[PDB]
Structure formats: C-alpha cells, structure tokens
Design a protein around this ligand. Structure first.
Ligand SMILES: [Ca+2]
Ligand SMILES: [Ca+2]
Ligand SMILES: [Ca+2]
Ligand SMILES: [Ca+2]
Ligand SMILES: [Ca+2]
Lengths: 310, 318
C-alpha cells in the first residue's frame, strides 16, 4: 500500500474539487517559477485549455509518446521509454483509469519508487507552455498528455523541472523496485554482451547507454554519424540477421528526442539490401522517430556504457 | 584504477601549472554563476555578493586537513545538500573508505598549484574528479560547506568536486542521493520506524561497526514545513547522520541509546540530550565517555524517542 507524498490523497482531493465545481490547484507544487526551477513568456496551461478533447492515452502508452522538450532530462525520459516495454510495471507507475472526461477535476496521480517502497504523487494538470505549445515532454500525438503529466509528477518529487536535468537518475527512480543497477564498460565488454542484453529486454529490465565526453562544451554535441554525446539513449531491442555468410548481431536504440544514427544498419542504410528481404521488412522501419538499428560492433565503438536496471 | 572525469589528469595538469607558475583554473567548471545553480542559487538573493576565493586568499596559512578528516569538519552552509553532508559525516567513521574518496597527499605548501582531486562512485566504478580551489564566499566567509576549524579546507573542496560532478552546487540540494554517491561501492536499505523490527538496535550496531553509512529523517505533510524546527529542537525534512549506538544501565535496566549528528554542526533538547539529567543517573565513567557537552550538532537520544520522533532510517551497506 503506497505512501501518500505530503499526505495528499488523489481520490479525496478529486472529490472535493468535483463537489466544489473547481479544478485542482496543487498547493504543494504551484504553477510558479519555483516549479520550473528558473524562458520568457512561459504560461501554465491545462490540456483542456490547449485542446478541445484532450486524451490521457491514445493508442496505448508507448515510447512513441516520449519526446524531450527544452529540458536536459534525457536519462529520465530514456528510462520512461524503456519502462513502456514492461507494460505491467508501466501501468503501476502510470494508473490507467485517468482521463479528461470522467471525474475530471484537473488532478492526476502517479506511483514512483523512493526509500524502498512505492510513493504516490498527486499533481494538477497545468503544464508549462510557450507559444501555445508544451515546453517540455510531449507525445508525437499532440492530443495525448500522459507523458507530459508523468514528467511533471517526477519534477514535483524532485523539487522542480530543472532538477530533472543532468543526472543519471532522479527521485522516484533510484534503485527502482529495489533492483540492481549494473554498468558495462563497452570498451572492455563481456563476450556474451548480446545474450545479456537479450535476457534483460525479455525480463522487462530497463536498458540505456551514453557516449562520454572530455569537455563540458562537447555535451549534447552531435557526431558526424548523428549520435548525440553525453545524452541518454534507450536500448529497445536486439536481433540477429545473416549478412555476408555469417550471423550479424544488431541492437536497437531510441533517442529520447524522438528524432538518428546515419551509419551501418541505419533506416535508409544499404546493408538491409544484403539480407533476407523478409528480415528487412520486419526490422528496417523507415521513420524519423529517434529509433534505429546499429550493429553490436558499431554500438561498442560509438558508446561508452551500457546500463541495465534489473 | 579510477576513470578520469572528462579525461582530466590531476598529476599532469598540476605540473603544467607549476611549470607555468600559474594557479589552475578548471576550464570544465568555471568559477561562474553556472557553477552555483538555477533557482535558490541562480542569477539574482542568496547569490548577491558572491566572491570566489581560494583558501590561500581567505587565510595566510590554509591547511587541507587539521587533526583528522572527521565529522566535526562537516558544517552545512546556505545550501540544502543535507543528505550529502550526512553521508560524508557518516563516511568519516569508515577511515579506509574516507581516504579513498579524500586523497591524503594534497596540501597548500609543497606542489601547491590551486588544483585538487577526489574519487567518487559513478556507474559501478571509481571516478576521479579534478577541481581548482576557488570557493564561493560571501561577507568574507565560505557560503557552503565549512569546517569548525576555519583554517581547514578538505571538506569545502570535497563538496565543490561533488558540485562539479552534479553540474552545480544547487544540484546537490533536495535529494536522497547525488552523482558520485548513487549505490556507493555497489551498496541501500530503508526501515519504517513506526513499524520497526524487534532487532533494530542490533541491525544499527552491526552496520555501524561494518563502516556502513546510516542516516535518518522526519517526513512532512506540507512543503512549507520542510526545515521547520520542533519544540525539542529537531529539524523536519532534514538528513541526519547516525554515528553511534550504546547500551547503558538506567533505572535498574539496560537502556538502548542512539547517537545522531545534524549536518548543520548545530540539537535534540529532550531526554539524554547534552545537558539532560538522565546522565547523572548512569555510571559516572559511561557519562564522562558518552555525554560530551558541545554545541556541535551531535547528541544522544533513547532508541525509544528516536523511533517516536523520526520516520525512517537508511542503511547503506558497503
Ligand atoms: Ca500513445
Ligand atoms: Ca537523421
Ligand atoms: Ca527510425
Ligand atoms: Ca579536521
Ligand atoms: Ca552536542
């Protein structure tokens, strides 16, 4: 039974609002510069003000819905994308019976992991905007707001949105479910890296990776093959194809921007025409979406580290 | 051997500076508003009149360590990084590990070039972080972490290297971990003090002797109630170090006592407090041993009042 953060109860607070005919304004996280953590013309808007018929979830709560905005919370967002592949645990963190029509009182709740247990966090649905548009996390589908709201929820538990940026975890994700964070030096990898990744993905584990830098000015810089440096990616898959008379190990990556690697095994790359055309159809998706394949060899050369949250 | 953060090598950068006859200025963490933070320490009240000064500009003869690297040297300044500072205070009770994080062959005399290094735990390994010794100051004083001995600077510099690794000083405030301390050495366990285990005393004692890091705090139901002070001088929503357990004989029975330290360096006013009358009712030697009368942040409580007053105990087993 989850701890109520600051003793706020979603159900009793929603009822109070509904009965009063008001929308929730969270006294513990005001729509103020202190919630931002710091940029002109930021106005807080509810989804019901930006849209006539806002949806909480459209076509399922998926990684497609994870596009980073003007905030350096890549690790959190690559983590949420990874979490979408573990559907049962995603829907612990993101309660599904939440929407903008039934019982709508401008209030939402999420469950996070803090201090060896589940914590329930209540928020109001005012979200920072600039120019009629969400500043921070948004979905590919503009009528969809579950991920915008989830991110505000993490920001609340971290003190402000800015505290979400820069680090390799956040409050609500530290030792998630009481599991073991494991890290692999990709420059000295295990011989069975492919299997360890495949097993983790099958187990509903969370995997991400980054490219280390040697200068603060090189952070977020983009390589000649369109990788972003010092930037958390999701590992979203692995497959084996037969290429040039031998097995060929592939790894699938997703940039939390939602928009990619231009090297071997990239979306429009020529290696896909030298495999079983059936495999090209199944694997080579040609969408500018942040998600792409690399060979596992190219993966270990380009990136510094693999993280696995078991 | 530890990974060098941003590829920065202490020994070769230090010699470059000595050979140049300059003092190191870290190009990767400028003594600028950016190194401070974004809201409570961003551009514009707590940051008005901040001057960065090296300890050599603050003092005529600055020291790195004076009479040991000990918890009395951890006094929190105008920055809400209490979990970190309770962690570091806790870590001072594990000497072997403290001196892996704080390399001892550093000073302000021989080889001094305004550069220091510390090793932290990041991504399942040790990381070495280099800093210059320019520290934030206001009104002629350190703003953030300082020692009780004003000529001592190891802990001030340590907290600066944590700030660097975390992006800025502000990044160290608010949390129950920080970059360089997440899953320290492969280590965390949490006890609900309102439904505690029968053997809690023994769990704590074992952990303290293992050289584990122990800490505790009081939860709030209101954000405004953070850092509020109770009628018995406890601070709410505030990281404390657990630094000791003892059993004394009191009113015919064994009495279990726990020692806590406020990382402000300044205390519980109740039973077993510094000047509490209970002490005059146990063996005089145990009183001289245990009852130190110093406003230093550190005090005893009975384990019974501890579980009544505090919400949660963290144990980070190394
Ligand atoms: Ca969707
Ligand atoms: Ca592209
Ligand atoms: Ca793509
Ligand atoms: Ca000292
Ligand atoms: Ca004292």
């Amino acid at each position: 039974n989850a701890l109520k953060y600051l003793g706020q109860d979603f159900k009793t607070l929603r009822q109070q609002c509904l009965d009063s005919g008001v929308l929730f304004k969270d006294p513990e996280f005001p729509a103020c510069p202190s919630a931002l953590g710091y940029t002109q013309g930021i106005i807080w808007k509810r989804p019901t003000e930006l849209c006539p018929s806002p949806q909480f979830i459209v076509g399922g709560a998926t990684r497609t819905d994870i596009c980073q905005g003007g905030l350096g919370d890549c690790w959190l967002l690559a983590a949420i994308a990874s979490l979408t592949l573990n559907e049962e645990l995603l829907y612990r963190v993101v309660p599904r019976d939440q929407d903008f029509q039934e019982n709508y009182a401008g209030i939402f709740h999420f469950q996070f992991w803090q201090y060896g247990e589940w914590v329930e966090v209540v928020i109001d649905d005012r979200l920072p905007t600039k120019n009629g548009q969400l500043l921070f996390l948004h979905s590919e589908q503009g009528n969809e707001f579950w991920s915008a709201l989830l991110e505000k929820a993490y920001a609340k538990l971290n003190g402000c949105y800015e505290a979400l940026a820069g680090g390799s975890t956040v409050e609500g994700f530290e030792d998630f479910t009481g599991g073991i964070s494991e890290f692999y030096d990709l420059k000295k990898p295990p011989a069975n890296l492919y299997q360890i990744i495949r097993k983790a993905l099958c187990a509903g584990s969370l995997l991400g990776c980054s490219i280390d830098v040697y200068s603060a000015a090189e952070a977020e810089a983009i390589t000649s093959q369109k990788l972003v440096k010092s930037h958390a990616y999701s590992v979203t898959g692995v497959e084996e194809v037969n290429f040039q008379g031998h097995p060929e190990k592939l790894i699938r990556l997703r940039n939390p921007w939602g928009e990619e690697w231009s090297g071997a095994w990239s979306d429009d790359a020529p290696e896909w025409n030298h495999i079983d055309p059936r495999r090209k159809e199944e694997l080579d998706k040609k969408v500018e979406d942040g998600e792409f394949w690399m060979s596992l060899s190219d993966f270990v050369r380009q990136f510094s580290r693999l993280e696995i949250c078991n």
